[PDB]
Ligand binder design. Sequence first.
Ligand SMILES: [Mg+2]
Ligand SMILES: [Mg+2]
Ligand SMILES: [Mg+2]
Lengths: 89, 89, 89
Amino acid sequence: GSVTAFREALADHVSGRLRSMTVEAREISGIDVTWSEGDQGTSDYGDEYTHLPELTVTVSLTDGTRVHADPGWCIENLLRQACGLEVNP
Amino acid sequence: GSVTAFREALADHVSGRLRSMTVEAREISGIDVTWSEGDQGTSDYGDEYTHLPELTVTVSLTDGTRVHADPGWCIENLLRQACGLEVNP
Amino acid sequence: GSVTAFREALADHVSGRLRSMTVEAREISGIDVTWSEGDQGTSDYGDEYTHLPELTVTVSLTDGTRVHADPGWCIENLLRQACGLEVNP
Ligand SMILES: [Mg+2]
Ligand SMILES: [Mg+2]
Ligand SMILES: [Mg+2]
């Protein structure tokens, strides 16, 4: 039940973010998430730099399509399922 | 088993962060998570701005109460359940 | 099935990040995740400070070993399991 619902919810979610604009769950072949830590420094010559942390979720489709998902939506729906709540209301 | 435990753990968690200060699982009606990407820029007039990324988890109760949960606690307990470990020890 | 797979995947993951360099799932006794919000300010004397947000996942082993896991890998594999996809491919 929950895997059906989550897969359909993720497919609905990336359909809005994009072959057709509409994505089906069977097309979902992978998920990649990267967390980039922040960094702040100064070169030996005085140039300051600040790299803000980044969280990126990429969904890969069987046809090679790659589409970003919203990390907040992803975490929200993991928590909803963990609590027995409706996904992607 | 795991949904019971997670719901009770989240209710315990937000009870400490708040009708009574104590929240019950049946009261939990929604969860909202937002991820705000960082941003850095400069206006055309030279004003610099830096917006740090933000991760926010909001739990909604049937009585309209909204209470923030700690994002680290949330992710920790998702991982604990995924590993068969005790939640919210 | 999924708890077996997740536990084995996490053990494989931290084995690469470290008694032996290889970690077994039965050794995994805890997980701790902290989210540190960003902060930006200025002291009353003009010193600026900027603390970037941080997400840290620490796995604890029965022998007291503590090892950091990659937060992106963790979130990725939660999402993979939620979608019925292979973990840690
Ligand atoms: Mg960037
Ligand atoms: Mg803010
Ligand atoms: Mg630091």
